[PDB]
Amino acid sequence: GPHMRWYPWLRPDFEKLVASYQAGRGHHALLIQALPGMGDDALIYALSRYLLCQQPQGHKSCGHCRGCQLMQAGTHPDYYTLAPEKGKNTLGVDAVREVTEKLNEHARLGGAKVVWVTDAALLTDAAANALLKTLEEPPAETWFFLATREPERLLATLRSRCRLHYLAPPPEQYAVTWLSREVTMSQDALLAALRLSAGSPGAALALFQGDNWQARETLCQALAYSVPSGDWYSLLAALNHEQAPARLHWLATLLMDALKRHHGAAQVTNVDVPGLVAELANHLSPSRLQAILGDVCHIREQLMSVTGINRELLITDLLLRIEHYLQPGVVLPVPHL
């Protein structure tokens, strides 16, 4: 939201990442890798505020000056943001083109010339290759920042120019404590939120304050009828909310916990639904369970990658295939190639 939100565990990293700029040895580029809602956005914002501030205070930005006063108004003439338009999802060549053509001119306020790409994975590869020159060899006093959920999906070249700084999710107990201070409910839900979100406290907050949690509950209840009866089709309404990737991820997490329960493991992710875990283990055969988990992950990938795919057809075929697999006498697929 307004200037986003600082996150308490982020303070160490920023300090390190500002030292390299205090000494003047700062690499112009930077590819911050951080989970969604982790808090990398606040880090990039605070960095840019320090960089473009005419008087950089020790570890702070200014205290008082116009140089970042224009930053707070979000109207600095050097500070550029590259985010896809609210009505679109792919960052076009045109915006990066405008930013890079306007970079060759001098710094308006006599300071740095800071750029920022809001999310690098959204960059079209044509835009990435238009931005390659600007990243590799920028003009003097030009800096960059980028944010990625993962770096491996980026273009082979763009990350090669940049430093791959990493944001480690906070320790499990600290994250649980912070979320408990923020949101109040049973710790099983909080552990499920953190482990589901791969440790991103911001993503756990989004899960709680977002409706999905209740919808998640819905799914659990639906499975509570499906697995004892072998009637999975009735899950359709639960798995279609334009959140098919996230809901399929929750389903795959449940199946992971069941397969863990087979090879009895001390820790599993879903701790709010142990009875569901036990039931899933009881009814389903391990080979069938792994084939079903593979199909769930495959469908989630197919939905996440290709936009414009029909969600209803995919999920319906998935549920029919699962129902087929629960019938004895079927040959299950195995990952290969």
């Binding site: 003047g24 060899e137 491996e152 999906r153 940049c162 792994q290």
Partner: protein
Amino acid sequence: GPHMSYQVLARKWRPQTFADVVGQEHVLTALANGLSLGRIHHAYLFSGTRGVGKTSIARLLAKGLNCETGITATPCGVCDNCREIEQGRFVDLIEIDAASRTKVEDTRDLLDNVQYAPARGRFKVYLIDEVHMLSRHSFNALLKTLEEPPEHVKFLLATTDPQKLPVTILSRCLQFHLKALDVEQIRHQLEHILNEEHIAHEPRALQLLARAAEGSLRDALSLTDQAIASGDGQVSTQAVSAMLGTLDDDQALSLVEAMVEANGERVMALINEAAARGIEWEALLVEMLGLLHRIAMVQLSPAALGNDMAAIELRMRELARTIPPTDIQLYYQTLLIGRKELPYAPDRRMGVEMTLLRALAFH
């Protein structure tokens, strides 16, 4: 004054003469001999993976080609033209990023430009980079100027991957496949750089940095900058190990020995501990793959033990003795496919969990 006199090693240590280039003797020799003997081709296509030197070799070629001191394989480096081309302010070396200039307007502009005389140098050279993403119309318009240009026009093409070139575009230009830099070459160049810049280091961290960057010197220097940013401006084994998050052979062998004996509970507890310490999962998978490779080598001929470390080689010898080759092959194949599917996994940790739990399939 405050103009950031410091420059990143990835650009400060850019080659400036044909004697400063690390490796690729297979192309430096050809280029230098062509410069000297009097055979120069009007379109050069340097192709190779990231951070191997296509732009640098092309810029050195430009420096040599339009030097005022004849046309020599050794640019003087003190003249004007050398200095501007090094700085990139020369009129006759024009940098075209093919991602931008792909519309027919810009290609028509370029074809209009090629018809005139030079300004300062003998040759007006278009360094077109990332050519492999010119729109088909751009390439078809560019065919004529790439085939039979005027006397003072030469083209230098830089591409990250030759595959996306229209094959006809390949055929009219002189291909130079820049080989990926070997780990020894990268480590020696890093040693020379770090000794030159009076920066303390030790050879072990150099080997780790060379291994991490899959044959890309620019990547090696990027990791060098990351390793000196953290760790009080020095390169050390602990620093690079923490930066990469890499793990010793003991833990990966614990994983493979628990998984080869179907100790699922132990495997999952080890994964939990590894997550608690927060390792890089791809690193875990590469270590497992390496251990399985060594086990296979030991199985094949007893001579090739695990002797690079030889710390817990007792476990490796025992595991080789007690496991048929088929089972190790299946474990390697499973872990490898799982490694291929980390990006597609919803989470890295859960992707590795899928792969390991699937490896647990055999009894």
